[PDB]
Amino acid sequence: HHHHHAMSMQDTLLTLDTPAAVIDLDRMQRNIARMQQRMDAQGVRLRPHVKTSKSVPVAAAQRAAGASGITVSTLKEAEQFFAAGTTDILYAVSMAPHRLPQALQLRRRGCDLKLIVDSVAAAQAIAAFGREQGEAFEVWIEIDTDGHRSGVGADDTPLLLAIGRTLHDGGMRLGGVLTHAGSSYELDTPEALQALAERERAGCVQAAEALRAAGLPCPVVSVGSTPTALAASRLDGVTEVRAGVYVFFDLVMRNIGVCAAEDVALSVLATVIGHQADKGWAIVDAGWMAMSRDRGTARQKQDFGYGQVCDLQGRVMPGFVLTGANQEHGILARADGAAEADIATRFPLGTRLRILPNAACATGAQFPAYQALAADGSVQTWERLHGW
């Protein structure tokens, strides 16, 4: 009854509508194990950044493999994962004072939500609101270890101490420091990545040691980007590493050199809807609205256009990429710029293909849900969050 109805209802890659975001669950599990084993080898916790998937069943797999808590990039993510049972949540974006009532309400409901700041003004806002509301917020100080984005300079002891004392004197819980070495995205050699992972570790530990030297607590030291989590040779002084895009990987990571195209677990299922035979084009229904506008591979060692073409079995078809994209139309052609002869027999109308993305975080956000592909060929819909 339940059985017979569910079979006659269950989808495969041939029955799905296109475009669709497909997770190869076997590749996803191998990626989750690889990262968790590496952090276990290092004796550090893994606090996965769920911004890559924003999907409960994906985070559940990461927790099942040994992850401790999660990092989120929005309070919407904190709300969704808290409602799904995660209590240990780091909101790793410089806290806006106007979001303080939502952060308070989450903590009041039982979410052990941590906030981050990098300025004396944001620390004063949190501490003043905490005092007025009788709430000892936990706050960590964000450190700039590579010049990329937010944070207090690791060697700026006077600002570190001013922010740490503002929090501690004001009765908040100064819980740690964190950094994200996002400049790792510019590198493409194991040497350079190892040296940057060492700078990220050294600088975040240096900031923790300056706070402690002044008598302030700083029990957590949190570092990480996917490339540096995979390349660090040593993590002395670090308590946890944050990494997110690893769960799926993507062609940017492939080009950085921390994975192979065959480790990429996310692909976009697409149908061939036409051709321009004289130009060697196949037109597919995955345009930039499916792939996203991310072109992070354009300035790396191999430009994959709007994505690398794979056959329906997920095997790369070398030399064919989406060379261009409009909103709902992707232009499939030879990467080397030749006109494929007979493109229409190589890619007949109605043929389905799988496109590996430049950037899994940007492609995944284009979809309300993923289709999680099991080894038997069946798919299940895994919702993910959109918006704020």
Added chain:
Amino acid sequence: QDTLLTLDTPAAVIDLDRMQRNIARMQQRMDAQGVRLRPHVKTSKSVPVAAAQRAAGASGITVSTLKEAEQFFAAGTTDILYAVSMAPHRLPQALQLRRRGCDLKLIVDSVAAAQAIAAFGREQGEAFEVWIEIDTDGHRSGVGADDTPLLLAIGRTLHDGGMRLGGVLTHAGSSYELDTPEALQALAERERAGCVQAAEALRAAGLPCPVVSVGSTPTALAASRLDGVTEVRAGVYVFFDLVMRNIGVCAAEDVALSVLATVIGHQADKGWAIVDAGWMAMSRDRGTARQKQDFGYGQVCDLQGRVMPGFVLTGANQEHGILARADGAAEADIATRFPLGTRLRILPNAACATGAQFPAYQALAADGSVQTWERLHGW
């Protein structure tokens, strides 16, 4: 009331007075040319935005996915053109829409797609309406404007197959690479001429071709005449954006969509203010990078919507935007100018891409109040 001070950020704000001026401008131009306007709702995917275009005199809509056809049909719109080469596997979905009472039109540019439609139509008892897409500028899909044998083959497949051959359409998307009035005008003419040529060639062989449909926002606004055309399709004009501004068909002040963002910190050394509108809010669209003025991830405006030339988002990560001087200098005391919590509005490179990042717009009225207007995501 909800207002720009009480909204969480980032938020996609439509300035309704600007939107309405854009709606009126395009409709008035299409009336002056004697053609119907069939707005492309892929820019907003929002019922009340399309409702405002229809109230101004629009005739039917164009959609980029059947999910939009479902949404707008469920909202009472029946005259729907799905202007993406039809995939045969979507024929059961198109059929169910037509049987439910949606006057859904499909397009094709190949004999094989026409044969798949006609064979399915006959089997199911449905005379699908299908238009043939014409390639008038080499940009994307379509039958070559002087490829008569292909055009006819398709036309005969449809008409002789018992389908309704309803028209020809073209989209001169190469207009996006232009940035002068003379060039846009010449491309609009080449777009018109080639679409008409194709209609005349169908008619000369005894085949029906009652609709001749052309358009992109730039060519709709540049075309000097539209003889032989029955309708124009345009979509991004409803809000405009910086790519359109650089093409030359609008001013930055006409852009009706902005992203409301909060300053969450600084890098005072480098003269940066960090905002909570990163590329997840703006999208990764960098269409202005290849134009004559690059606006990074968007042009900064103050909370009142006044443009602040010279400040743009020079960089963006997923949830962090880097606001800094376009001239590359380090603004001195950027923190004193934009203290923590300051709200700003960012104009997008591409309104279609930026709007897709949000589950809804915040529609801003003259009294400063906002109403949330949901829009569609996905397929």
